[PDB]
Amino acid sequence: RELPCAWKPVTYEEAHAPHYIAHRKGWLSLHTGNLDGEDHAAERTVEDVFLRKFMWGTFPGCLADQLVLKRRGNQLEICAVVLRQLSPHKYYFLVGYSETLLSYFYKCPVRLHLQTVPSKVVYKYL
């Protein structure tokens, strides 16, 4: 009517700040490229960016929390956390689809490790 009358949940990853990455958080992607003497760090970074974009675009609104991309040898393990909103048959379809498509795009044995939670696991409210 007149002026003087007038006058967010966060996950553990979201809650903590960038200056805690080696103190309270960890690294979502884990590989040997950045170690001293190792090579191909940029290729791994590009692969990581494409992996995250693809996984978020192929599981729209299903991913509760960020991906974790692990590499052992030439294996590529996508540990994802999703919700229980989508039907299990569609989850299996998408799992097989993504596994095959990423294996043939990167020429390595990709594998995917869905973990369903009932809902977002809030840590604080910011």
Binding site: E2, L3, C5, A6, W7
Partner: protein
């Protein structure tokens, strides 16, 4: 459209084409980089000698950003409309279809967002110092450009009486002395804040509480003189009308200033949408005179920057501002030259001098190989985005546009 390819030609009065180069064609109104007087500079630095540390840089940046981003006070009409809209939206939603009292509270909570909190700035001595150090040079540059307009087009004008509403630091007075120093004999300055009056006096006395004024004839007042009998030659209001808490106050202040105006009334505000809207409100107020039988029966017109008296073509969504470059006052944070963006309007008593008025460029002119882009506000009351080329409009037109800049006048006829 003041620019028809092949038809419109340059207006060659006084033989400027034959008797003068094109860079000095009559419509040039560019002002070189503005440098403040040594007296004002030394005074400001001496007054800020007491405390000019890292905190002052942060305070100056914060205050400048707050002033630049500040919006006009929201009148009850728009708030009522927004409240009705949001009320209806919440009624539609089953989840938010709560009781009336609960509903009204939620609408108020959402109106706390999507709306700007307008707060009066209470300028104390500290905030007065910060505003000085933040805006003295910018205000001086803007006012200097505004006065240079009047001189460049009307050099026969020799004012003797100046008034300044919302005179915070004396920038208008300093510019007026730097320009018309050989004819002015009185400088009326008005400001509700006592601290700014003290600061302006101290600056005029060379940054010392005891001294001799650099500019003679300055009068300082706290309350606006309200009487049509006393009429000044020039009345100025720079970055002042935005401080008033409601549109009614702006209305009454603008009416009073116009009533006390003899020759020229200059209004200067920040170069944002808010300032442009405020200046157009003032323009429509003055042009559409409502006084039944005022003491001064002379009519009024827009001397600058508009070449017409119709409603602005840009007031729908866009704005209309100008830029003036200036050398900032030496400080621990002021190194490179800056640019002041400001909107201005000059209203003059009487009628337009002639009928050969010229378009105004309201945007940076872009030079490109063999063509020039100019945004022109035509005397007919419309904007025109013109690409000038020698082949289409002629060599003289193309060269004149090539030498012109932002805020100039393009001398065309028919």
């Amino acid at each position: 459209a003041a620019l028809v390819p092949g038809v419109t030609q340059v207006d060659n009065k006084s033989g400027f084409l034959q008797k003068r180069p094109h860079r000095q064609h009559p419509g040039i109104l560019k002002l070189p980089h503005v440098r403040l007087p040594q007296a004002l500079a030394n005074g400001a630095q001496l007054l800020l000698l007491g405390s000019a540390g890292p905190t002052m840089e942060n305070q100056v940046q914060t205050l400048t950003s707050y002033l630049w981003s500040r919006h006009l006070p929201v009148e009850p009409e728009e708030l009522q409309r927004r409240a009705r809209h949001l009320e209806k939206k919440f009624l539609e939603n089953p989840d938010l279809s709560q009781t009336e009292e609960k509903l009204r509270g939620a609408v108020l909570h959402a109106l706390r967002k999507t709306t700007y909190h307008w707060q009066e700035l209470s300028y104390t001595e500290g905030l007065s110092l910060v505003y000085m150090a933040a805006r003295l040079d910018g205000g001086f540059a803007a006012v200097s450009r505004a006065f240079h307009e009047i001189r460049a087009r009307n050099p026969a004008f020799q004012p003797q009486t100046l008034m300044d509403f919302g005179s915070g630091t004396g920038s208008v007075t300093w510019a007026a002395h730097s320009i018309w120093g050989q004819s002015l004999r009185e400088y009326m300055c008005v400001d509700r804040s006592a601290a700014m009056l003290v600061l302006a006096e101290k600056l005029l006395k060379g940054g010392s509480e005891s001294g001799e004024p650099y500019i003679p004839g300055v009068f300082f007042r706290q309350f606006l003189p309200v009487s049509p009998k006393v009429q000044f030659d020039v009345v100025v209001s720079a970055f002042s009308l935005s401080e008033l808490p409601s549109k009614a106050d702006r209305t009454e202040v603008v009416q009073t200033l116009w009533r006390k105006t003899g020759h020229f009334l200059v209004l200067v505000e920040n170069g944002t949408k808010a300032g442009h809207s405020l200046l157009m409100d003032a323009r429509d107020l003055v042009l559409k005179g409502k006084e039944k039988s005022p003491l001064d029966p002379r009519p009024g017109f827009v001397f600058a920057p508009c070449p017409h008296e119709l409603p602005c073509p840009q007031l729908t969504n866009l704005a209309c501002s100008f830029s003036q470059a200036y050398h900032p006052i030496p400080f621990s944070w002021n190194k490179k030259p800056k640019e002041e963006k400001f909107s201005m309007v000059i209203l003059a008593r009487g009628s337009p001098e002639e009928a050969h008025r010229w378009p105004r460029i309201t945007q940076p002119v872009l030079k490109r190989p063999r063509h020039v882009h100019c945004h022109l506000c035509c005397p007919d009351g419309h904007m025109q985005h013109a690409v000038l080329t020698a082949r289409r409009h002629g060599r003289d037109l193309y060269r004149c546009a090539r030498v012109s800049s932002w805020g100039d006048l393009l001398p065309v006829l028919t």
